[PDB]
Amino acid sequence: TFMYDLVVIGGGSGGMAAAKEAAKYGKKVALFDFVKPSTQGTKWGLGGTCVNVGCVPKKLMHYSALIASSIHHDAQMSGHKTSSSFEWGKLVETLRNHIRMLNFSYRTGLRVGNVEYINALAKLIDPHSVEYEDNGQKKTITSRYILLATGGRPSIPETVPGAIQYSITSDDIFFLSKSPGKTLVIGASYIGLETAGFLNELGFDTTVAMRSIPLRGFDRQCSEKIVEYMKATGTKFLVGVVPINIEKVNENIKVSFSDGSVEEFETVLYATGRNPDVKGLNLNAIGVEVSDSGKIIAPKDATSVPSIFAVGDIVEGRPELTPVAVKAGILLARRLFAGSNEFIDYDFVPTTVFTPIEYGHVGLSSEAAIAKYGEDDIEEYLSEFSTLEIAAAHREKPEHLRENEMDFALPLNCLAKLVVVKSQGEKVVGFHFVGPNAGEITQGFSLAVKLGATKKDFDDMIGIHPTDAEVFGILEVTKRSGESFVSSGGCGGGKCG
Amino acid sequence: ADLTFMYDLVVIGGGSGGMAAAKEAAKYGKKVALFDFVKPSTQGTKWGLGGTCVNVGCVPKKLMHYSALIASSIHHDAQMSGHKTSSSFEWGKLVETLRNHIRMLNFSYRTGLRVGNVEYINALAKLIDPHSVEYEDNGQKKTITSRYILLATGGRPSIPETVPGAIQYSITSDDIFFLSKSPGKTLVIGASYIGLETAGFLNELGFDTTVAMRSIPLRGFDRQCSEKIVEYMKATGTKFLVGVVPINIEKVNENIKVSFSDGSVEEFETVLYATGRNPDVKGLNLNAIGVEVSDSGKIIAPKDATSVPSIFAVGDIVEGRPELTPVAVKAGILLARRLFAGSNEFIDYDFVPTTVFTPIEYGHVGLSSEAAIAKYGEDDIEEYLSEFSTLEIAAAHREKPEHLRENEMDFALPLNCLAKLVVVKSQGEKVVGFHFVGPNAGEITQGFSLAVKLGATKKDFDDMIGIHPTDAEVFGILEVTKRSGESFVSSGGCGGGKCG
Ligand SMILES: Cc1cc2nc3c(=O)[nH]c(=O)nc-3n(C[C@H](O)[C@H](O)[C@H](O)COP(=O)(O)OP(=O)(O)OC[C@H]3O[C@@H](n4cnc5c(N)ncnc54)[C@H](O)[C@@H]3O)c2cc1C
Ligand SMILES: Cc1cc2nc3c(=O)[nH]c(=O)nc-3n(C[C@H](O)[C@H](O)[C@H](O)COP(=O)(O)OP(=O)(O)OC[C@H]3O[C@@H](n4cnc5c(N)ncnc54)[C@H](O)[C@@H]3O)c2cc1C
């Protein structure tokens, strides 16, 4: 009856994962991926946003930034007097070489996994039919099931003159042929703070235009600590201010702001948000229902058309993360072809923001815990402190950023916080860690929290010394107490005695 | 009864267990004295308050390892990350940074005892009777009496008296962190965690480094993880002499000539014994008081109570518990609460995570493959694993030193990570051992150690959402078993996780 069991539109995190899992059950699977060029003409190989213009290149640029920070702050104190100069084009070559190998690895992975990969834009014709172009000619294939996994693309405001013509996005930043120099980042999203963070660490003059608050939706205390640290290390923030006009003035971009100020930059990067890439799919003619944001309505991965499914960044009401796209794709394949009833538990989706000091969490912010349980049923335990290694190095604020002689130190690099429900025996409902290696620390704690750990389980946990992570075994200061949660000790996360 | 005693608690030893118990006791309004005095090392090194971890253990070790990691990043990663660097190492500068940090910790602990209402006496104490301790103050020996006495004197490095020249010419972990002259070409004797950590950081800092290993690396630890560490250390330039120990150590000019048990001879600038540590209890007068010791010299106190019921012990001197700072600290705190606050709480010794801070680190909790197979039988065990590279490290294409190359193709360091779960099939693949070799292994292991203590199964790991990109996310996607015999090697470049 159908040429295929499953046709996947999109060769990113969710699409590649669903397609390969489906083919393991002996099913006939096709996958389409084609990269429409960015607003500045950037394009790239198979594997989607994470592989090409997301998690992978972002993590490599952050690693370069952490090396720059250790050479500047730490190396001499560790006995390694080091002079260095940064070559943007060399970091870009390293990123491009690594991503080019991943492109080929994913191409081979689909073929070996018995998935037919077609490098073409696909569009829906009917609930069982997909159209694409091959060598001039439009062809149709039929499938029992169709998965939409086309992800998102950066948003640039149409209502700001010159924004679309002169600005770059995350689609362009990792591959720029020339260093960005003096840079404006618009948006205090995780993408904007990560990007501003690594550009400032690499030595670029960096400004963030923040419409309101940093990391809207994340814990306020952790979000503000990140901004405090970024400011102390040289990122400038324009608070409550957005570009209204962008023009080329000689070799620079002249930006006019919503408060009447004007400033020239070499690079202007929009990191405001991402829109789901669905306008080309012909959703309205097929009867696939979309929300007011343009995302697909598919709370259990099933669209309004029962033969059409969706996972990843295009689906309303789920976090835009690689592991959530991957796991949704795999579990969908198992429900379709292996009689699984398994769904992701969306209450336990940990995440990490790779800012100059990183931020990992799972469960509820202080604000969401207070909203759900009430202030009286919540205890917040916290400690702000320095990594042992970093404390010994005596990191100092750049001279130009000091308010006075007293303002010499960087802020403490770590904040550990547990959010607990008193009526459930101080069950942990929120875990928060700001500091180095925050993703590495949060991963295992996120499983402990998912399994129902209480404050008592944390207090009875034997520490690994010396680590930052061991701090979670010895939290005692509460927000309610109003006592100082600052530790000026030098043994790091843990107690030497 | 208590009215006959000057103190509620007298603590002998101002290290991890002693300072923790003393301060916890004083929080309940009890009258507490603490003795600490540092007998100089076999090479005359001495230091301030705070014990082995603060002065000559975890703290200086972690700072030297951080310096080693910086050296490795500059050498292997910086240019690939776009940072063209020139660098040189000054041993004296690293030692100054350690000494400044440790001097501030000495001062901070001195302050913390005073503020915490603990009377600190800088003198050696010894037992007189079950309620009495003696020390010297300005020539004169004084006695103080106490309801309870805590012994927390820790250990000191062991050097074999039966090896001629060993005691005269060798240094130990007591000396290495403060040497006035950089160690140069160095022999480390012992493939203990202390020996491999010390050899690891000296090699990373650029010293010609040899380990003399009597038998196996990291005896008592998982064999597969221990062998992976030695493979990595060899690939980065540490030389291993297997089944060979020094039998003679002699001065020849400015160098130390070492004669080995196999008839080989080699000259070094520095010889460091990292064979083991003996409990420092010989001066406490334990025999006359009736405090029972094992044949190793450790105090018998499985619940912290010695054979004398007014005398307690915690930390490295107690038979049958791990020699770790957090186990000393937690034991001292819980002892103080059981004595003065009606607590019933003891450490659960089944879940004591640890990390070896080798050039690639190794964290674990629960059972090795060997102990799980010994306890449950091979047929009831599954081992799931993945060997792989950290994303950022894979992108850097780290290379072996030229002297270790065997061909055009032999360029790469080994993969830096190994993740392993040891599960019991009959208990629904309950996890009984967690193992991670790689960067940040202590940071990764801490949280997983709580999940394992709470009874996590393979299914709980498989249903855990990963944080991407991390090494730790690999624990959500383990599928290759040892039993399968299939390759557990991943040569992909997305790191711990799958991008699709
Ligand atoms: C700068 C940045 C950093 C990020 N960092 C992280 C991070 O550290 N951790 C993390 O977990 N997540 C991160 N993310 C998010 C992550 O990249 C996404 O959540 C994830 O890639 C979404 O997967 P997906 O399957 O929904 O789609 P994508 O991976 O976006 O793949 C969709 C694919 O479909 C293609 N396509 C679109 N329309 C069609 C069509 N009609 N026919 C054919 N092909 C089509 C696209 O070109 C693309 O290749 C980051 C994102 C960005 C932008
Ligand atoms: C090189 C090295 C690295 C280590 N790394 C780590 C690590 O990374 N993580 C970890 O958890 N553990 C580590 N350890 C172990 C850790 O240092 C110990 O487990 C811990 O310090 C033991 O605490 P304690 O209370 O038993 O005694 P100690 O901390 O050893 O303190 C005992 C104190 O008592 C004093 N003393 C002895 N006799 C007397 C007396 N009669 N009167 C008065 N004072 C006396 C001693 O001088 C000393 O100050 C390491 C050890 C070494 C040697």
TrEMBL record, chain A:
Binding site for FAD 1: S13, G14, G15, D33, K36, T49, K58, A122, D313, T322, H465
List of catalytic residues: H465
Annotated binding of FAD, by residue: K59, D313
UniProt domain Pyridine nucleotide-disulphide oxidoreductase dimerisation: residue ranges: 349-472
GO process terms (BP): cell redox homeostasis; cellular response to oxidative stress; glutathione metabolic process
Pfam families xref list: Pyr_redox_2, Pyr_redox_dim
Protein's name in the database: Thioredoxin reductase
Species the sequence originates in: Cryptosporidium parvum
Gene it is expressed from: TRx
UniProtKB/TrEMBL annotation, chain B:
Family affiliation: Belongs to the class-I pyridine nucleotide-disulfide oxidoreductase family.
The protein's required cofactors: FAD
Role played: Catalyzes the transfer of electrons from NADPH to thioredoxins TRX1, TRX2 and TRX3, which in turn act as reductants of disulfide containing proteins. Able to reduce nitroglutathione (GSNO), a compound involved in the transport of nitric oxide (NO); however, TRX1 is more efficient in reducing GSNO. Has no catalytic activity towards oxidized glutathione (GSSG).
EC number: 1.8.1.9
Residues annotated as the enzyme's active site: H468 (proton acceptor)
Protein name as it appears in the record: Thioredoxin reductase
Binding-site residues for FAD 1, renumbered to this chain: S16, G17, G18, D36, K39, T52, K61, A125, D316, T325, H468
Keywords: Disulfide bond, FAD, Flavoprotein, NAD, NADP, Nucleotide-binding, Oxidoreductase, Redox-active center, Signal
Amino acids binding FAD: K62, D316
Keyword NADP listed: yes
Residue span(s) of domain FAD/NAD(P)-binding: 7-332
Any Pfam family the entry gives: Pyr_redox_dim
UniProt xrefs under PROSITE patterns: PYRIDINE_REDOX_1
Domain of life: Eukaryota
UniProt-annotated binding residues for NAD(+): G190, A191, S192, Y193, I194, G195, L196, E197, G276
Residues that, per the record, bind FAD 2: S16, G17, D36, F37, K39, T52, K61, A125, D316, T325, H468
Organism encoding this protein: Cryptosporidium parvum
Residue numbers binding FAD 3: S16, G17, D36, F37, T52, C53, K61, A125, D316, T325, H468
Cofactor note: Binds 1 FAD per subunit.
